[PDB]
């Protein structure tokens, strides 16, 4: 059945890069658009990025140049490159999936990965 | 809209309609939305 799993979380120095992976199992990776969302402890959810089958990446206007969304369809995976980490990016990250031939319901969700930045 | 107005009157006249005034209260409005051009009363037989 449908399953999203994530990896790449941990406790890292600020300014060091990260590569968060979202592997999809059970459904064909095409015809769906993939989202990266984060939520901070004590704060609500904040949307990070979108990527489509074409390769069009759309980012939040609030945060610019910090992340890079990279889709791969040979092995049905999604990658996030995070650069110039600040102290405020301690958060739980989620991988989300919307169907391209409907409204923007995010359907099933990832379990989440923890990113803790410290000095 | 099908408006049904009705009034019950206690009379004791034998043959014709009594002469008087009685305004009919609205009883029920029906949202039917259909064409009606003909009607027929329904009676009851007495069997013995």
């Amino acid at each position: 059945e449908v399953q999203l799993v994530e990896s790449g979380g941990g406790v890292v120095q600020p300014g060091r890069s990260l590569r968060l992976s979202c592997a999809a199992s059970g459904f064909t990776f095409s015809s769906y658009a993939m989202h990266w969302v984060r939520q901070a402890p004590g704060k609500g959810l904040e949307w990070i990025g979108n990527i489509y089958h074409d390769g069009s990446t759309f980012y939040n206007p609030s945060l610019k140049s910090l992340v890079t969304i990279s889709r791969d369809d040979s092995t049905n995976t999604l990658y996030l490159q995070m650069n110039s980490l600040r102290a405020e990016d301690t958060a739980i990250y989620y991988c989300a999936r919307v169907w391209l031939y409907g409204s923007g319901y995010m359907d099933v969700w990832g379990k989440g990965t923890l990113v803790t930045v410290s000095s | 809209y099908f408006k049904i107005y009705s009034k019950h009157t206690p009379i004791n006249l034998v043959r014709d309609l009594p002469q008087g005034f009685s305004a009919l209260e609205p009883l029920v409005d029906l949202p039917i939305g259909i064409n009606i051009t003909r009607f027929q009363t329904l009676l009851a037989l007495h069997r013995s």
Binding site: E1, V2, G26, F27, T28, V108 | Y1, P31, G33
Partner: protein, 49 residues
Amino acid sequence: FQPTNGVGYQPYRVVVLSFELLHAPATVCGPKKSTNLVKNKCVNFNFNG
């Protein structure tokens, strides 16, 4: 349709609601959230339309 199939081959039940706005009276309306009644004050009243 089998339970071992993944998402996309699973049976989906679909109900499609279509609305009609013909010259017939609008019998179908939304719910009517009645609030509490306040007296002796200049208020905007809406009683049954």
